[PDB]
Structure 1
Amino acid sequence: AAVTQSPRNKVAVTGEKVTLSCQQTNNHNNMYWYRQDTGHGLRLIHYSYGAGSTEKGDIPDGYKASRPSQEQFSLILESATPSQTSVYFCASGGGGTLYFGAGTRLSVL
């Protein structure tokens, strides 16, 4: 419903830069980037507390990030590599509640 991901599919090329966009409607301070793996659930990569802020999550090597607007939060693969392929989500959230979007299938060869 409330936190759109661009692109929605996307295969990329051993050694490119991929940039996934996460846009949201409710003007929440907080935003996060999780990669689902299998028998892994969502592990967190980077999060952020407003325009200008980004923090390490649990798996954070590889990926840079950046929150230029309120509404918009980008994850970035410094140099795409096979092992970064996954299904990637973000969320916004005021306090107790979270709000995800529907996944980005990234496949890298």
Structure 2
Amino acid sequence: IQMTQSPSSLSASVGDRVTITCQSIKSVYNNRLGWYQQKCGKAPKLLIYETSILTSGVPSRFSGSGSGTDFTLTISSLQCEDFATYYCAGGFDRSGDTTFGQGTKVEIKRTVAAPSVCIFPPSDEQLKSGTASVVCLLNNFYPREAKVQWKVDNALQSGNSQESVTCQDSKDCTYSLSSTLTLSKADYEKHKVYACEVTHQGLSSPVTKSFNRG
């Protein structure tokens, strides 16, 4: 059974002290308790081993404590680059009784940041085939809530767009977002203005970026 971690997710501001707990049923064998940090898209990284010893190069803001069945990871001055899922891992004997905790997500709150917006028309190569993708990019905003609306010749679109979002940025805690509008070449060629309108609490009114085909 995975060891128990608490909470499942938490958020605090830059500079705050936060604590993550790890609890097991059996007592740990010979201080075999370590803590891993996993950033998006990346392998976990060992931050602390044998309960309280820091990996070389890990900043001193991380510390580990506890014993037996109850362990704590503390981050004493939360930074944007600490956005990650943290896992404890333990050994209870020397013959195969070892497991991970369920993970705890850490998010970092910061001030509002408005996105800067970019729009891309379909490339000529893609237009050579029968498909046309239009891409709207929202860069470096906070918080994550954002409405992207596509308009073609001022007609609103639904069902032909998809978005995805990065994780919180290591340097400035912002998100970035891409929205892709998919049309057929035939429908693309019938129309002239392509626009994406962005609504975000950092902008006093919605921002529209657009292009005229050709």
Q: When the two structures are superposed, what TM-score results if normalisation uses the length of structure 1?
A: 0.84
CA distance in 1, matches of 2:74, 2:105: 14
CA distance in 2, matches of 1:77, 1:5: 15
- Describe the SS at the equivalent of 1:83: helix
Contact 2:39/2:83, CA 8 A, preserved across alignment = no
Give deviations 1:38-88, integer Å, cap 9, x for gaps: 34311001122xxxx621225521302112x30011111111111101001
**Structure 1 residue 45 and structure 2 residue 47: aligned?**
yes
Give the number of the structure whose alpha-carbon radius of gyration is greater: 2
CA distance in 1, matches of 2:95, 2:45: 19
Taking only aligned residues, the RMSD between alpha carbons, in angstroms, comes to 1.7
Query: 2:106 aligns to what?
Result: 106
Q: Which has the higher contact order (CA 8 A, sep 6+)?
A: 1
1:27-106 correspondence runs (5 A): 27-29=27-29, 30-48=32-50, 54-58=52-56, 60-61=58-59, 62-67=61-66, 69-93=67-91, 94-95=93-94, 97=96, 98-106=98-106
Contact 1:44/1:59, CA 8 A, preserved across alignment = no
Contact 2:16/2:77, CA 8 A, preserved across alignment = yes
Q: When the two structures are superposed, what TM-score results if normalisation uses the length of structure 2?
A: 0.45
Contact 2:52/2:63, CA 8 A, preserved across alignment = no
In percent, how many aligned pairs have the same letter? 28
In structure 2, stretches of 5+ residues that fail to align are 110-214
